[PDB]
Design a protein around this ligand. Structure first.
Ligand SMILES: Nc1ncnc2c1ncn2[C@@H]1O[C@H](COP(=O)(O)OP(=O)(O)O)[C@@H](O)[C@H]1O
Ligand SMILES: [Mg+2]
Length: 300
């Protein structure tokens, strides 16, 4: 009935391009100790640390599978990928073998539905982009931003008005929708916008209403030019508050951004949340890697 935000760090390999430009790793990663060392003497610990050799299935098992279980119990869940552009958020979240979190979680969801034969289940999905505090519905997109509203009901549940929700019965249908949403996003950068893929599960007793939501979010790139003036800083403020024993029982400032408002019922409290902080090990990215390590640390 209450749980901390779980923070996972994912370190990707140094990329060919980075190697060819003369860069080398500035991170020593110790997965079994749950920790990393930046440069010579900057040490950071996280709930889960995944090294460059951790494959997609390993990330999914470490970070996401336990959310999937709470989702079917009727808890809300979110997994978000955070980090600078180029760090591996999209690769990790898998919405665009090498398949990422979304296809694996959806594959498992439909198997669970098949297994729970005493429940009658309905699943629908929405797929939204947030850019400069305006929504675009990627499954419609003929939808004016002004016609999508984010509200909250009396029981604290987030209510979307004007967003397309599509019933799905299998992974094939989910993959098809993701392909079209991703096509629709282009015909403004993907690294300056957030995307939110929301899966809603409605379960009723007898013969395959408890309602839960699982959000999969691929956040805007965290890089900075160098107080709360950005959606990433609003999200960081919220997760900081939740992780702070003095602040966590006080008023959590969800209202500051659309991203924190849409996740309000699915971020800490009674919901289960995992942040996957993605980092480049490249020495060329030292400063942004430090920024992400520090941001992720504030959530613990
Ligand atoms: N864990 C990983 N293993 C191998 N390649 C990766 C990994 N993470 C990211 N990459 C690659 O690094 C590049 C940037 O990844 P991407 O997912 O686009 O990052 P972001 O979404 O954070 O900008 C892509 O070419 C991607 O294939
Ligand atoms: Mg990306």
């Amino acid at each position: 009935e209450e749980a901390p935000v779980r923070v996972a760090l994912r370190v990707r390999p140094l990329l060919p391009k980075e190697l060819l430009h003369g860069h080398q790793s500035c991170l020593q990663v110790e997965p079994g100790l749950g920790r990393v060392t930046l440069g010579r003497d900057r040490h950071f610990g996280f709930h889960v640390v995944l090294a460059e050799d951790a494959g997609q299935e390993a990330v999914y098992q470490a970070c996401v599978q336990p959310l999937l279980e709470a989702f079917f119990e009727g808890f809300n869940a979110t997994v978000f990928a955070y980090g600078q552009t180029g760090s591996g958020k999209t690769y990790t979240m898998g919405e665009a073998d090498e398949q990422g979190i979304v296809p694996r979680a959806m594959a498992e969801a439909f198997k669970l539905i098949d297994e729970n034969d005493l429940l009658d289940c309905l699943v629908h999905v929405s797929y939204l982009e947030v850019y400069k505090e305006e929504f675009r519905d990627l499954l419609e997109v003929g939808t004016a931003s002004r016609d999508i509203q984010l509200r909250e009901d009396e029981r604290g549940n987030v209510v979307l008005c004007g967003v397309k929700e599509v019933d799905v019965e299998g992974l094939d249908e989910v993959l098809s929708l993701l392909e079209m949403g991703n096509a629709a996003r282009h015909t403004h950068l993907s690294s300056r916008s957030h995307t939110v893929f929301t899966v809603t599960l409605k379960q009723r007793g007898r013969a395959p209403l408890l309602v839960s939501k699982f959000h999969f979010v691929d956040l805007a790139g965290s890089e900075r030019v160098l107080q709360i003036n950005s959606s990433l800083l609003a999200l960081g403020n919220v997760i900081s508050a939740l992780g702070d024993p003095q602040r966590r029982g006080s008023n959590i400032p969800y209202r500051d951004s659309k991203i924190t408002r849409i996740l309000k019922d699915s971020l800490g409290g009674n919901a289960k949340t995992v942040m996957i902080a993605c980092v480049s090990p490249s020495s060329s990215d030292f400063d942004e890697t430090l920024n992400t390590l520090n941001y992720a640390s504030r959530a613990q």
